[PDB]
Protein backbone atom coordinates (compact mmCIF):
# COMPACT_ATOMS: atom_id res chain seq x y z
CA UNK A 1 0.00 0.00 0.00
CA UNK A 2 3.01 2.30 0.54
CA UNK A 3 3.92 1.56 -3.09
CA UNK A 4 0.52 3.07 -3.92
CA UNK A 5 1.37 6.12 -1.76
CA UNK A 6 4.56 6.79 -3.78
CA UNK A 7 2.81 6.04 -7.11
CA UNK A 8 -0.02 8.48 -6.24
CA UNK A 9 2.53 11.14 -5.21
CA UNK A 10 4.29 10.72 -8.59
CA UNK A 11 0.96 11.13 -10.44
CA UNK A 12 -0.05 14.19 -8.37
CA UNK A 13 3.29 15.99 -8.86
CA UNK A 14 3.56 15.01 -12.56
CA UNK A 15 -0.06 15.15 -13.87
CA UNK A 16 -2.64 15.79 -11.11
CA UNK A 17 -6.16 14.99 -12.40
CA UNK A 18 -4.84 13.81 -15.78
CA UNK A 19 -4.55 10.76 -18.07
CA UNK A 20 -1.73 9.56 -15.76
CA UNK A 21 -2.73 6.41 -13.83
CA UNK A 22 -0.90 4.97 -10.79
CA UNK A 23 0.43 1.40 -10.38
CA UNK A 24 -1.40 -0.04 -7.37
CA UNK A 25 0.74 -3.18 -6.87
CA UNK A 26 4.49 -3.47 -7.35
CA UNK A 27 4.26 -7.09 -8.56
CA UNK A 28 2.17 -6.18 -11.63
CA UNK A 29 4.46 -3.26 -12.55
CA UNK A 30 6.42 -4.80 -15.46
CA UNK A 31 3.05 -5.72 -17.02
CA UNK A 32 2.11 -2.01 -17.18
CA UNK A 33 5.21 -1.09 -19.22
CA UNK A 34 4.72 0.70 -22.57
CA UNK A 35 3.31 -1.32 -25.52
CA UNK A 36 1.61 -3.52 -22.86
CA UNK A 37 -2.19 -4.12 -22.71
CA UNK A 38 -4.39 -3.09 -19.70
CA UNK A 39 -8.10 -3.87 -19.34
CA UNK A 40 -10.95 -2.09 -17.57
CA UNK A 41 -13.25 -3.37 -14.82
CA UNK A 42 -16.63 -2.13 -13.59
CA UNK A 43 -16.15 -0.24 -10.28
CA UNK A 44 -18.56 2.61 -9.37
CA UNK A 45 -15.77 4.38 -7.43
CA UNK A 46 -14.20 4.66 -10.91
CA UNK A 47 -12.78 2.70 -13.86
CA UNK A 48 -10.19 0.24 -12.47
CA UNK A 49 -7.28 -1.20 -14.52
CA UNK A 50 -5.94 -4.77 -14.49
CA UNK A 51 -2.98 -6.25 -16.33
CA UNK A 52 -3.50 -8.60 -19.28
CA UNK A 53 -0.17 -10.42 -19.77
CA UNK A 54 -0.44 -9.50 -23.48
CA UNK A 55 1.28 -6.85 -25.66
CA UNK A 56 0.59 -5.15 -28.99
CA UNK A 57 3.34 -7.45 -30.29
CA UNK A 58 1.15 -10.48 -29.43
CA UNK A 59 -1.88 -9.20 -31.45
CA UNK A 60 -0.28 -7.32 -34.37
CA UNK A 61 0.71 -9.02 -37.61
CA UNK A 62 4.42 -9.46 -36.87
CA UNK A 63 5.20 -9.64 -40.63
CA UNK A 64 7.04 -12.92 -39.99
CA UNK A 65 8.19 -13.06 -36.32
CA UNK A 66 11.81 -12.96 -37.61
CA UNK A 67 12.17 -9.47 -36.09
CA UNK A 68 9.52 -8.24 -33.66
CA UNK A 69 12.09 -6.07 -31.85
CA UNK A 70 11.98 -3.28 -34.50
CA UNK A 71 8.73 -2.06 -32.85
CA UNK A 72 10.75 -0.81 -29.83
CA UNK A 73 12.43 1.57 -32.33
CA UNK A 74 9.14 3.50 -31.96
CA UNK A 75 9.72 3.91 -28.17
CA UNK A 76 11.01 7.37 -27.12
CA UNK A 77 12.50 8.63 -23.79
CA UNK A 78 11.33 12.20 -23.00
CA UNK A 79 14.17 12.08 -20.43
CA UNK A 80 14.20 11.98 -16.62
CA UNK A 81 11.99 13.72 -14.03
CA UNK A 82 12.22 14.54 -10.29
CA UNK A 83 9.51 13.91 -7.63
CA UNK A 84 9.78 15.63 -4.21
CA UNK A 85 8.60 13.06 -1.61
CA UNK A 86 6.46 14.46 1.26
CA UNK A 87 7.40 14.56 4.98
CA UNK A 88 6.01 11.13 6.01
CA UNK A 89 8.18 9.56 3.24
CA UNK A 90 11.86 8.93 4.16
CA UNK A 91 14.60 7.49 1.87
CA UNK A 92 16.40 5.32 4.48
CA UNK A 93 20.12 4.63 4.08
CA UNK A 94 19.42 15.05 2.98
CA UNK A 95 16.84 17.53 4.41
CA UNK A 96 15.07 17.92 1.02
CA UNK A 97 14.17 14.43 -0.28
CA UNK A 98 13.40 13.70 -3.97
CA UNK A 99 13.30 10.65 -6.31
CA UNK A 100 14.46 10.40 -9.96
CA UNK A 101 12.16 8.82 -12.60
CA UNK A 102 12.40 8.08 -16.37
CA UNK A 103 9.66 8.81 -18.96
CA UNK A 104 9.17 6.38 -21.88
CA UNK A 105 6.59 7.21 -24.61
CA UNK A 106 5.43 5.48 -27.83
CA UNK A 107 6.09 7.63 -30.96
CA UNK A 108 2.98 9.51 -32.14
CA UNK A 109 3.78 8.37 -35.69
CA UNK A 110 3.44 4.72 -34.70
CA UNK A 111 0.20 5.65 -32.91
CA UNK A 112 -1.03 7.06 -36.23
CA UNK A 113 0.05 4.01 -38.25
CA UNK A 114 -1.54 1.70 -35.65
CA UNK A 115 -5.07 2.05 -37.04
CA UNK A 116 -3.82 1.41 -40.59
CA UNK A 117 -2.20 -1.92 -39.74
CA UNK A 118 -3.07 -5.63 -39.94
CA UNK A 119 -3.44 -8.03 -36.98
CA UNK A 120 -2.09 -11.61 -37.19
CA UNK A 121 -4.43 -14.09 -38.96
CA UNK A 122 -4.02 -16.37 -35.90
CA UNK A 123 -4.51 -14.61 -32.52
CA UNK A 124 -4.32 -15.88 -28.87
CA UNK A 125 -7.66 -17.26 -27.55
CA UNK A 126 -7.40 -14.52 -24.87
CA UNK A 127 -7.26 -11.86 -27.64
CA UNK A 128 -9.76 -13.93 -29.70
CA UNK A 129 -12.11 -13.51 -26.67
CA UNK A 130 -10.59 -10.09 -25.74
CA UNK A 131 -13.92 -8.54 -26.91
CA UNK A 132 -6.00 -0.43 -23.97
CA UNK A 133 -2.30 0.09 -24.90
CA UNK A 134 0.21 1.70 -22.46
CA UNK A 135 1.41 4.94 -24.14
CA UNK A 136 3.62 6.48 -21.40
CA UNK A 137 5.52 4.96 -18.43
CA UNK A 138 7.35 6.75 -15.58
CA UNK A 139 9.73 4.17 -14.06
CA UNK A 140 12.43 4.12 -11.34
CA UNK A 141 15.97 4.87 -12.64
CA UNK A 142 17.60 3.18 -9.61
CA UNK A 143 16.63 1.10 -6.54
CA UNK A 144 14.66 3.24 -4.04
CA UNK A 145 14.10 2.02 -0.44
CA UNK A 146 11.43 4.30 1.10
CA UNK A 147 9.50 4.24 4.44
CA UNK A 148 6.31 5.96 5.72
CA UNK A 149 5.07 6.85 9.25
CA UNK A 150 1.55 7.82 8.05
CA UNK A 151 -1.45 6.20 9.83
CA UNK A 152 -5.26 6.17 9.23
CA UNK A 153 7.18 2.36 10.03
CA UNK A 154 6.17 0.80 6.71
CA UNK A 155 8.95 0.06 4.22
CA UNK A 156 9.02 -0.62 0.45
CA UNK A 157 12.08 -1.39 -1.75
CA UNK A 158 11.16 -0.46 -5.36
CA UNK A 159 13.56 -2.38 -7.66
CA UNK A 160 14.99 -0.27 -10.53
CA UNK A 161 13.17 0.17 -13.87
CA UNK A 162 9.81 -0.50 -12.13
CA UNK A 163 6.81 1.30 -13.73
CA UNK A 164 5.24 3.73 -11.20
CA UNK A 165 2.67 5.66 -13.32
CA UNK A 166 1.16 4.87 -16.76
CA UNK A 167 -0.97 6.59 -19.44
CA UNK A 168 -3.07 4.47 -21.87
CA UNK A 169 -4.80 5.15 -25.22
CA UNK A 170 -7.83 3.23 -26.62
CA UNK A 171 -7.04 0.22 -28.86
CA UNK A 172 -9.06 0.53 -32.13
CA UNK A 173 -9.12 -1.67 -35.29
CA UNK A 174 -10.01 -0.98 -38.99
CA UNK A 175 -21.10 11.82 -9.95
CA UNK A 176 -21.49 12.31 -6.15
CA UNK A 177 -22.00 9.23 -3.93
CA UNK A 178 -24.85 11.03 -2.11
CA UNK A 179 -26.53 11.51 -5.51
CA UNK A 180 -25.70 7.92 -6.53
CA UNK A 181 -27.03 6.26 -3.35
CA UNK A 182 -30.04 8.61 -3.47
CA UNK A 183 -30.74 7.63 -7.10
CA UNK A 184 -30.33 3.90 -6.32
CA UNK A 185 -32.57 4.13 -3.23
CA UNK A 186 -35.21 5.90 -5.37
CA UNK A 187 -35.05 3.18 -8.07
CA UNK A 188 -35.57 0.55 -5.35
CA UNK A 189 -38.45 2.38 -3.58
CA UNK A 190 -40.45 2.00 -6.84
CA UNK A 191 -40.56 -1.78 -6.10
CA UNK A 192 -43.06 -4.11 -4.35
CA UNK A 193 -42.25 -5.28 -0.80
CA UNK A 194 -42.22 -8.84 -2.22
CA UNK A 195 -39.88 -7.86 -5.09
CA UNK A 196 -37.52 -5.95 -2.76
CA UNK A 197 -37.49 -9.00 -0.46
CA UNK A 198 -36.38 -11.11 -3.45
CA UNK A 199 -33.54 -8.66 -4.25
CA UNK A 200 -32.50 -8.68 -0.56
CA UNK A 201 -32.67 -12.50 -0.34
CA UNK A 202 -30.16 -12.51 -3.24
CA UNK A 203 -27.83 -9.67 -2.20
CA UNK A 204 -27.62 -11.39 1.19
CA UNK A 205 -26.47 -14.53 -0.60
CA UNK A 206 -23.81 -12.28 -2.16
CA UNK A 207 -22.49 -11.38 1.32
CA UNK A 208 -19.23 -13.23 1.97
CA UNK A 209 -19.30 -15.21 -1.30
CA UNK A 210 -17.26 -13.79 -4.18
CA UNK A 211 -18.48 -16.79 -6.17
CA UNK A 212 -22.13 -15.82 -5.70
CA UNK A 213 -21.27 -12.14 -6.16
CA UNK A 214 -19.62 -12.70 -9.55
CA UNK A 215 -22.38 -15.12 -10.55
CA UNK A 216 -25.22 -12.72 -9.73
CA UNK A 217 -23.36 -9.78 -11.29
CA UNK A 218 -22.83 -11.76 -14.50
CA UNK A 219 -26.48 -12.86 -14.54
CA UNK A 220 -27.95 -9.41 -13.87
CA UNK A 221 -25.74 -8.10 -16.67
CA UNK A 222 -26.73 -11.02 -18.93
CA UNK A 223 -30.48 -10.52 -18.55
CA UNK A 224 -29.79 -6.81 -18.95
CA UNK A 225 -28.19 -7.57 -22.32
CA UNK A 226 -30.84 -10.04 -23.50
CA UNK A 227 -33.63 -8.22 -21.66
CA UNK A 228 -35.60 -11.47 -21.42
CA UNK A 229 -36.49 -13.46 -18.32
CA UNK A 230 -35.06 -16.95 -18.74
CA UNK A 231 -37.58 -19.77 -18.40
CA UNK A 232 -35.67 -20.96 -15.32
CA UNK A 233 -32.78 -19.23 -13.57
CA UNK A 234 -31.22 -20.06 -10.19
CA UNK A 235 -31.70 -16.43 -9.17
CA UNK A 236 -34.86 -15.95 -11.23
CA UNK A 237 -36.81 -13.80 -8.69
CA UNK A 238 -34.04 -11.17 -8.73
CA UNK A 239 -34.13 -10.70 -12.51
CA UNK A 240 -37.92 -10.89 -12.28
CA UNK A 241 -37.79 -7.93 -9.91
CA UNK A 242 -35.63 -6.25 -12.56
CA UNK A 243 -38.64 -6.17 -14.93
CA UNK A 244 -41.72 -4.02 -14.21
CA UNK A 245 -45.33 -5.32 -13.93
CA UNK A 246 -45.55 -5.16 -17.76
CA UNK A 247 -42.25 -7.11 -17.82
CA UNK A 248 -40.52 -4.10 -19.46
CA UNK A 249 -36.99 -4.17 -18.03
CA UNK A 250 -36.46 -1.09 -15.85
CA UNK A 251 -32.76 -0.72 -16.65
CA UNK A 252 -32.30 1.49 -13.58
CA UNK A 253 -32.99 -1.48 -11.29
CA UNK A 254 -30.28 -3.67 -12.87
CA UNK A 255 -27.74 -0.83 -13.19
CA UNK A 256 -28.17 -0.09 -9.47
CA UNK A 257 -28.13 -3.77 -8.39
CA UNK A 258 -24.86 -4.09 -10.32
CA UNK A 259 -23.68 -0.84 -8.64
CA UNK A 260 -24.39 -2.35 -5.19
CA UNK A 261 -22.40 -5.42 -6.29
CA UNK A 262 -19.54 -3.22 -7.59
CA UNK A 263 -19.33 -1.51 -4.17
CA UNK A 264 -19.48 -4.85 -2.30
CA UNK A 265 -16.26 -5.55 -4.21
CA UNK A 266 -14.57 -2.79 -2.17
CA UNK A 267 -15.52 -4.42 1.17
CA UNK A 268 -13.57 -7.68 1.68
CA UNK A 269 -13.21 -8.09 5.48
CA UNK A 270 -15.97 -5.66 6.56
CA UNK A 271 -18.47 -7.86 4.65
CA UNK A 272 -18.83 -10.18 7.67
CA UNK A 273 -20.01 -7.21 9.78
CA UNK A 274 -22.81 -6.35 7.31
CA UNK A 275 -23.81 -10.04 7.09
CA UNK A 276 -24.06 -10.52 10.88
CA UNK A 277 -26.09 -7.29 11.08
CA UNK A 278 -28.57 -8.38 8.37
CA UNK A 279 -28.70 -11.63 10.41
CA UNK A 280 -29.60 -9.72 13.62
CA UNK A 281 -31.33 -6.56 12.33
CA UNK A 282 -28.60 -4.26 13.73
CA UNK A 283 -28.01 -2.73 10.26
CA UNK A 284 -29.47 0.64 11.40
CA UNK A 285 -26.82 0.87 14.16
CA UNK A 286 -23.99 0.03 11.71
CA UNK A 287 -25.26 2.62 9.20
CA UNK A 288 -25.01 5.25 11.95
CA UNK A 289 -21.46 4.33 13.04
CA UNK A 290 -20.34 4.49 9.38
CA UNK A 291 -22.02 7.93 9.14
CA UNK A 292 -20.41 9.13 12.40
CA UNK A 293 -16.85 8.13 11.37
CA UNK A 294 -17.44 9.63 7.91
CA UNK A 295 -18.75 12.95 9.31
CA UNK A 296 -16.30 13.06 12.27
CA UNK A 297 -13.03 12.46 10.35
CA UNK A 298 -14.30 14.12 7.14
CA UNK A 299 -15.95 17.52 6.49
CA UNK A 300 -18.57 17.14 3.69
CA UNK A 301 -17.05 13.77 2.65
CA UNK A 302 -20.35 13.41 0.72
CA UNK A 303 -19.80 16.88 -0.85
CA UNK A 304 -8.05 8.26 2.34
CA UNK A 305 -8.57 4.66 1.09
CA UNK A 306 -10.76 4.41 4.23
CA UNK A 307 -12.99 7.20 2.85
CA UNK A 308 -13.81 5.17 -0.29
CA UNK A 309 -14.19 2.07 1.94
CA UNK A 310 -16.63 3.96 4.20
CA UNK A 311 -18.67 5.32 1.26
CA UNK A 312 -19.03 1.69 0.10
CA UNK A 313 -20.30 0.48 3.50
CA UNK A 314 -22.81 3.37 3.60
CA UNK A 315 -24.07 2.51 0.09
CA UNK A 316 -24.28 -1.23 0.91
CA UNK A 317 -25.91 -0.79 4.35
CA UNK A 318 -28.21 1.99 3.09
CA UNK A 319 -29.54 -0.18 0.23
CA UNK A 320 -29.90 -3.29 2.42
CA UNK A 321 -31.71 -1.37 5.16
CA UNK A 322 -33.90 0.14 2.43
CA UNK A 323 -34.87 -3.28 1.07
CA UNK A 324 -35.78 -4.76 4.47
CA UNK B 1 50.25 20.83 -20.32
CA UNK B 2 47.62 20.94 -17.51
CA UNK B 3 48.10 17.15 -17.16
CA UNK B 4 50.32 18.00 -14.16
CA UNK B 5 47.46 20.23 -12.88
CA UNK B 6 45.15 17.22 -13.39
CA UNK B 7 47.56 15.24 -11.17
CA UNK B 8 47.61 18.11 -8.62
CA UNK B 9 43.79 18.07 -8.52
CA UNK B 10 44.05 14.35 -7.65
CA UNK B 11 46.66 15.02 -4.91
CA UNK B 12 44.07 17.49 -3.51
CA UNK B 13 41.34 14.80 -3.16
CA UNK B 14 39.78 15.60 0.26
CA UNK B 15 38.81 12.42 2.22
CA UNK B 16 35.85 11.03 0.21
CA UNK B 17 36.79 12.50 -3.18
CA UNK B 18 37.38 9.81 -5.82
CA UNK B 19 39.46 12.34 -7.83
CA UNK B 20 41.84 9.57 -8.94
CA UNK B 21 39.14 7.78 -10.97
CA UNK B 22 38.30 11.09 -12.66
CA UNK B 23 42.03 11.76 -13.19
CA UNK B 24 42.17 8.46 -15.11
CA UNK B 25 38.86 9.20 -16.90
CA UNK B 26 39.99 12.73 -17.89
CA UNK B 27 43.45 11.49 -18.96
CA UNK B 28 41.86 8.73 -21.10
CA UNK B 29 39.56 11.23 -22.87
CA UNK B 30 42.50 13.61 -23.42
CA UNK B 31 44.91 10.91 -24.70
CA UNK B 32 42.22 9.22 -26.85
CA UNK B 33 40.58 12.54 -27.86
CA UNK B 34 37.30 11.03 -26.53
CA UNK B 35 34.00 12.94 -26.87
CA UNK B 36 32.12 11.90 -23.66
CA UNK B 37 33.30 13.08 -20.23
CA UNK B 38 31.27 11.69 -17.30
CA UNK B 39 32.80 12.31 -13.82
CA UNK B 40 29.45 11.67 -12.04
CA UNK B 41 29.30 9.55 -8.83
CA UNK B 42 32.90 10.54 -7.87
CA UNK B 43 32.18 12.74 -4.79
CA UNK B 44 33.92 15.69 -6.52
CA UNK B 45 34.00 19.10 -4.74
CA UNK B 46 35.64 20.84 -7.74
CA UNK B 47 36.48 20.23 -11.43
CA UNK B 48 39.89 20.71 -13.15
CA UNK B 49 40.12 22.50 -16.52
CA UNK B 50 38.18 20.63 -19.16
CA UNK B 51 39.49 19.66 -22.61
CA UNK B 52 38.16 22.10 -25.23
CA UNK B 53 37.38 19.15 -27.58
CA UNK B 54 34.60 17.57 -25.42
CA UNK B 55 31.00 18.55 -26.35
CA UNK B 56 29.23 16.53 -23.59
CA UNK B 57 30.07 16.72 -19.84
CA UNK B 58 28.16 14.53 -17.32
CA UNK B 59 29.06 15.54 -13.73
CA UNK B 60 25.86 14.74 -11.79
CA UNK B 61 25.69 13.10 -8.32
CA UNK B 62 28.69 15.17 -7.06
CA UNK B 63 29.32 18.06 -4.58
CA UNK B 64 30.17 20.84 -7.09
CA UNK B 65 29.27 24.50 -6.32
CA UNK B 66 30.70 26.24 -9.42
CA UNK B 67 31.73 24.94 -12.89
CA UNK B 68 34.91 25.69 -14.90
CA UNK B 69 34.53 27.52 -18.26
CA UNK B 70 32.67 25.32 -20.79
CA UNK B 71 34.36 24.34 -24.12
CA UNK B 72 33.00 26.61 -26.91
CA UNK B 73 31.94 23.42 -28.69
CA UNK B 74 29.85 21.86 -25.91
CA UNK B 75 26.33 20.73 -26.87
CA UNK B 76 25.04 18.93 -23.72
CA UNK B 77 25.66 19.77 -20.02
CA UNK B 78 24.45 17.54 -17.12
CA UNK B 79 25.05 19.05 -13.64
CA UNK B 80 22.04 17.61 -11.76
CA UNK B 81 22.45 16.52 -8.10
CA UNK B 82 25.05 19.29 -7.59
CA UNK B 83 25.10 22.39 -5.32
CA UNK B 84 25.94 24.66 -8.29
CA UNK B 85 25.24 28.29 -7.29
CA UNK B 86 25.92 29.62 -10.82
CA UNK B 87 26.60 28.14 -14.30
CA UNK B 88 29.50 29.42 -16.47
CA UNK B 89 28.89 31.03 -19.91
CA UNK B 90 26.83 28.85 -22.25
CA UNK B 91 28.44 28.13 -25.66
CA UNK B 92 26.07 28.78 -28.63
CA UNK B 93 26.91 25.13 -29.51
CA UNK B 94 25.11 23.90 -26.34
CA UNK B 95 21.76 22.25 -27.31
CA UNK B 96 21.00 20.48 -23.98
CA UNK B 97 21.43 22.07 -20.50
CA UNK B 98 20.26 20.01 -17.46
CA UNK B 99 21.25 21.39 -14.00
CA UNK B 100 18.25 20.27 -11.87
CA UNK B 101 18.62 19.32 -8.16
CA UNK B 102 20.73 22.48 -7.74
CA UNK B 103 20.59 25.80 -5.88
CA UNK B 104 20.47 28.05 -8.96
CA UNK B 105 18.47 31.27 -8.29
CA UNK B 106 19.19 32.81 -11.73
CA UNK B 107 20.21 31.38 -15.14
CA UNK B 108 22.89 32.49 -17.66
CA UNK B 109 21.89 33.75 -21.14
CA UNK B 110 20.52 30.81 -23.19
CA UNK B 111 21.95 30.11 -26.70
CA UNK B 112 19.37 30.12 -29.56
CA UNK B 113 20.46 26.61 -30.68
CA UNK B 114 19.43 25.05 -27.33
CA UNK B 115 16.58 22.48 -27.65
CA UNK B 116 16.53 21.02 -24.09
CA UNK B 117 16.58 22.99 -20.79
CA UNK B 118 16.02 21.10 -17.50
CA UNK B 119 16.34 23.45 -14.49
CA UNK B 120 13.95 21.90 -11.98
CA UNK B 121 14.38 21.45 -8.22
CA UNK B 122 16.14 24.82 -8.02
CA UNK B 123 15.55 28.21 -6.37
CA UNK B 124 15.18 29.97 -9.76
CA UNK B 125 13.29 33.29 -9.36
CA UNK B 126 13.30 34.40 -13.04
CA UNK B 127 14.13 32.59 -16.32
CA UNK B 128 16.31 34.06 -19.13
CA UNK B 129 15.09 34.70 -22.70
CA UNK B 130 13.86 31.36 -24.06
CA UNK B 131 15.32 30.30 -27.46
CA UNK B 132 12.69 29.10 -29.99
CA UNK B 133 14.78 25.98 -30.78
CA UNK B 134 13.84 24.77 -27.25
CA UNK B 135 11.14 22.07 -27.57
CA UNK B 136 11.32 20.88 -23.94
CA UNK B 137 11.52 23.00 -20.77
CA UNK B 138 11.36 21.71 -17.16
CA UNK B 139 11.20 24.56 -14.60
CA UNK B 140 9.26 22.82 -11.81
CA UNK B 141 10.15 22.72 -8.08
CA UNK B 142 11.26 26.39 -8.33
CA UNK B 143 9.96 29.75 -6.95
CA UNK B 144 9.11 31.35 -10.34
CA UNK B 145 6.04 33.66 -10.50
CA UNK B 146 6.27 34.96 -14.10
CA UNK B 147 7.07 32.46 -16.90
CA UNK B 148 8.72 34.21 -19.89
CA UNK B 149 6.67 34.24 -23.15
CA UNK B 150 6.64 30.63 -24.48
CA UNK B 151 8.58 29.88 -27.74
CA UNK B 152 6.81 28.72 -30.95
CA UNK B 153 8.14 25.10 -30.95
CA UNK B 154 7.47 24.24 -27.29
CA UNK B 155 6.25 20.64 -27.08
CA UNK B 156 6.56 19.87 -23.34
CA UNK B 157 6.38 22.50 -20.58
CA UNK B 158 6.45 21.19 -17.00
CA UNK B 159 6.03 24.40 -15.00
CA UNK B 160 4.34 23.08 -11.86
CA UNK B 161 5.08 23.63 -8.16
CA UNK B 162 6.04 27.28 -8.72
CA UNK B 163 4.77 30.66 -7.48
CA UNK B 164 3.16 31.48 -10.86
CA UNK B 165 0.18 33.88 -10.39
CA UNK B 166 -0.49 34.88 -14.04
CA UNK B 167 -1.03 32.49 -17.01
CA UNK B 168 1.62 32.83 -19.79
CA UNK B 169 1.18 34.22 -23.31
CA UNK B 170 1.43 31.57 -26.03
CA UNK B 171 2.70 31.75 -29.61
CA UNK B 172 -0.95 32.01 -30.77
CA UNK B 173 -0.98 28.59 -32.46
CA UNK B 174 2.36 29.11 -34.21
CA UNK B 175 2.72 25.34 -33.70
CA UNK B 176 0.07 22.91 -34.94
CA UNK B 177 1.65 19.74 -33.42
CA UNK B 178 0.64 17.94 -30.18
CA UNK B 179 1.63 20.00 -27.09
CA UNK B 180 1.55 19.14 -23.34
CA UNK B 181 1.87 22.06 -20.86
CA UNK B 182 1.66 21.51 -17.06
CA UNK B 183 0.76 24.46 -14.82
CA UNK B 184 -0.69 22.68 -11.79
CA UNK B 185 -0.04 23.58 -8.12
CA UNK B 186 0.73 27.20 -9.16
CA UNK B 187 -1.17 30.12 -7.55
CA UNK B 188 -3.22 31.30 -10.60
CA UNK B 189 -6.73 32.82 -10.14
CA UNK B 190 -7.79 33.86 -13.68
CA UNK B 191 -6.94 32.95 -17.32
CA UNK B 192 -6.71 34.71 -20.74
CA UNK B 193 -9.30 34.50 -23.58
CA UNK B 194 -6.37 33.62 -25.91
CA UNK B 195 -6.87 30.10 -24.48
CA UNK B 196 -10.37 30.06 -26.06
CA UNK B 197 -8.61 30.38 -29.46
CA UNK B 198 -6.20 27.40 -29.01
CA UNK B 199 -6.72 24.09 -30.85
CA UNK B 200 -7.18 20.70 -29.18
CA UNK B 201 -3.46 20.12 -29.80
CA UNK B 202 -2.90 21.90 -26.47
CA UNK B 203 -3.04 19.77 -23.28
CA UNK B 204 -3.14 21.94 -20.12
CA UNK B 205 -3.22 20.91 -16.42
CA UNK B 206 -4.24 23.86 -14.19
CA UNK B 207 -5.56 21.64 -11.36
CA UNK B 208 -4.84 22.79 -7.76
CA UNK B 209 -4.34 26.43 -8.82
CA UNK B 210 -6.60 28.96 -6.98
CA UNK B 211 -8.65 29.67 -10.16
CA UNK B 212 -11.81 31.84 -9.79
CA UNK B 213 -15.32 30.30 -9.67
CA UNK B 214 -16.14 32.37 -12.78
CA UNK B 215 -13.43 30.66 -14.88
CA UNK B 216 -14.52 27.29 -13.42
CA UNK B 217 -18.10 27.84 -14.64
CA UNK B 218 -16.81 29.15 -18.00
CA UNK B 219 -14.40 26.26 -18.47
CA UNK B 220 -16.98 23.75 -17.23
CA UNK B 221 -19.47 25.11 -19.77
CA UNK B 222 -16.81 24.88 -22.48
CA UNK B 223 -15.98 21.25 -21.61
CA UNK B 224 -19.69 20.34 -21.87
CA UNK B 225 -20.30 21.26 -25.52
CA UNK B 226 -20.04 18.94 -28.55
CA UNK B 227 -19.07 21.87 -30.80
CA UNK B 228 -16.11 22.55 -28.48
CA UNK B 229 -13.03 20.94 -30.03
CA UNK B 230 -10.70 23.18 -28.01
CA UNK B 231 -7.49 22.21 -26.15
CA UNK B 232 -7.58 19.15 -23.85
CA UNK B 233 -7.78 20.96 -20.46
CA UNK B 234 -7.71 19.64 -16.85
CA UNK B 235 -8.71 21.46 -13.63
CA UNK B 236 -9.54 20.86 -9.93
From Swiss-Prot, chain B:
Q: How is it modified after translation?
A: Ubiquitinated in the presence of host E1 ubiquitin-activating enzyme, E2 ubiquitin-conjugating enzyme and ubiquitin.
Give one GO term, molecular function aspect: ubiquitin protein ligase activity
* Major localization class: secreted
The organism named in the record is Shigella flexneri
Tell me the impact of changing residue 184 to G.
Abolished ability to ubiquitinate GSDMB
This protein's GO cellular component annotations are:
extracellular region; host cell cytoplasm
Q: Which residues of the full protein are shown?
A: 26 to 261 of 565
Tell me, which GO biological process terms does this entry list? effector-mediated activation of host programmed cell death by symbiont; protein ubiquitination; symbiont-mediated suppression of host programmed cell death; ubiquitin-dependent protein catabolic process
The name on file for this protein is: E3 ubiquitin-protein ligase ipaH7.8
Interaction with target proteins: annotated span:
1-236
Tell me where on the tree of life, at the top rank, the source sits.
Bacteria
**Location of the protein in the cell:** Secreted; Host cytoplasm
Question: In UniProt terms, what function does this protein have?
Answer: E3 ubiquitin ligase effector protein that interferes with host's innate immunity. Functions to alter host cell physiology and promote bacterial survival in host tissues. Catalyzes ubiquitination of human gasdermins GSDMB and GSDMD, promoting their degradation by the proteasome, thereby preventing cell death. In contrast, activates host cell pyroptosis in mouse cells: catalyzes ubiquitination of mouse Nlrp1b allele 1 protein, releasing the cleaved C-terminal part of Nlrp1b, which polymerizes and forms the Nlrp1b inflammasome followed by host cell pyroptosis.
Anything noted about its domains? Answer: The LRR (leucine-rich repeat) domain forms a slightly curved solenoid and may mediate interaction with target proteins.
Q: Which gene encodes it?
A: ipaH7.8
Amino acid sequence: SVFEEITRIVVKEMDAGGDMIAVRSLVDADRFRCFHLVGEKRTFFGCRHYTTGLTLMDILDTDGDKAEFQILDNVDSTGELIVRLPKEITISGFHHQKIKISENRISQQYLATLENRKLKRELPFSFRSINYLVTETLETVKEETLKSDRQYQREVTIPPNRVLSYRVKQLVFPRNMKEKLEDMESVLKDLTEEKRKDVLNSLAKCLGKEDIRQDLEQRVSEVLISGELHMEDPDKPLLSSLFNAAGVLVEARAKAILDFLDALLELSEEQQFVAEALEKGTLPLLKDQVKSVMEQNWDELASDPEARILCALYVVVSILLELA
Amino acid sequence: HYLRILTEWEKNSSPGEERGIAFNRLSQCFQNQEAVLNLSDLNLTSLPELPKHISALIVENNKLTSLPKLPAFLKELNADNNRLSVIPELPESLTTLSVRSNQLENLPVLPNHLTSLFVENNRLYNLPALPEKLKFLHVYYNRLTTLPDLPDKLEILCAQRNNLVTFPQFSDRNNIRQKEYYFHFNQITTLPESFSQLDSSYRINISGNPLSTRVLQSLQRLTSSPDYHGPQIYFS
